[PDB]
Amino acid sequence: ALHFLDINATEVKKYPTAIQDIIINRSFDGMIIRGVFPRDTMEQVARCLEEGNDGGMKSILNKNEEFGTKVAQIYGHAIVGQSPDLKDYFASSAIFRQACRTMFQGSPDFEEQVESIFHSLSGLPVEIPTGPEGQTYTPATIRLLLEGREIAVHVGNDFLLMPAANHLKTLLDLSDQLSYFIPLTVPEAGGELVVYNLEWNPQEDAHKYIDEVESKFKSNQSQSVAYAPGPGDMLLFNGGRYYHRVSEVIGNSPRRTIGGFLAFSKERNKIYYWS
Numbered sequence: 001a002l003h004f005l006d007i008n009a010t011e012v013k014k015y016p017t018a019i020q021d022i023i024i025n026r027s028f029d030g031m032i033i034r035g036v037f038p039r040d041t042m043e044q045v046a047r048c049l050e051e052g053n054d055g056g057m058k059s060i061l062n063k064n065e066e067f068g069t070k071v072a073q074i075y076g077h078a079i080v081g082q083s084p085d086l087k088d089y090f091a092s093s094a095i096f097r098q099a100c101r102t103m104f105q106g107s108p109d110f111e112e113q114v115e116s117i118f119h120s121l122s123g124l125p126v127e128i129p130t131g132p133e134g135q136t137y138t139p140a141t142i143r144l145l146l147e148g149r150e151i152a153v154h155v156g157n158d159f160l161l162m163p164a165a166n167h168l169k170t171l172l173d174l175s176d177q178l179s180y181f182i183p184l185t186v187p188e189a190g191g192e193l194v195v196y197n198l199e200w201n202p203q204e205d206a207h208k209y210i211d212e213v214e215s216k217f218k219s220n221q222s223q224s225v226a227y228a229p230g231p232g233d234m235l236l237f238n239g240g241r242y243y244h245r246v247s248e249v250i251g252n253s254p255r256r257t258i259g260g261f262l263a264f265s266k267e268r269n270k271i272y273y274w275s
Ligand SMILES: [C-]#[N+][C@@H]1[C@H](c2c[nH]c3ccccc23)[C@@H](C(=C)C)CC[C@@]1(C)C=C
Pocket: 064, 067, 070, 071, 072, 073, 074, 078, 080, 081, 143, 151, 152, 153, 154, 206, 209, 210
């Protein structure tokens, strides 16, 4: 249904227009990049988190208790479902980048590594958007999926229609919004990204959003594909256009991903990435 590449991170230099090709030319829909981060780094970082020895990352952990099991616990305020003012977002964002830099210990640094991937696939500058008064957006959040939890079906271009995105809209292109994530830890089973042939309908509170995509999606039958990247593999895809979810986690070992999103600037002069 959907066309996904599977390449090694050593090869990224050879796909200088991958991001153009996914968003603009629509010539394929996504991409697994193996070994963007070493497995060592991924274990170190996961152990920093589970031991609570994490640069204080735990203090910006949203347990999302009131959602039950169709959502991740998330470290960092994700831009989604935030008030339009963004005071908490921007505060959380400064903390995240600190704790994250600390956990990666430059071996390699998260932001440096990811930016060089996005650079290699665009030939463009890559930046974390800055806010209207010079605040920083978070480059990423960390998603924790315990046993029996999943991420409910959703589509990413919807996010840029929420009040939270007002400011960011003023920076970005019309065009689609990619999703990216790297697993830190993968579960024994489940926790797969399932992507659907079904596209964001531009004709058309994250509680009522999830109940109203569940009935929208179950109206259509459409074709699916599933991906289960390993620790340190990046999955990068047109999650803006295509409905997708993450399947229930099976077994004790939980699923931890670090990820966000990715889009062209106003004039396609550069890439922005955030969560
Ligand atoms: C899981 N997850 C998030 C989104 C999400 C669901 N409840 C939330 C509460 C606060 C902040 C973000 C969320 C999710 C949905 C909107 C259904 C999409 C994926 C993810 C990881 C996005 C950042």
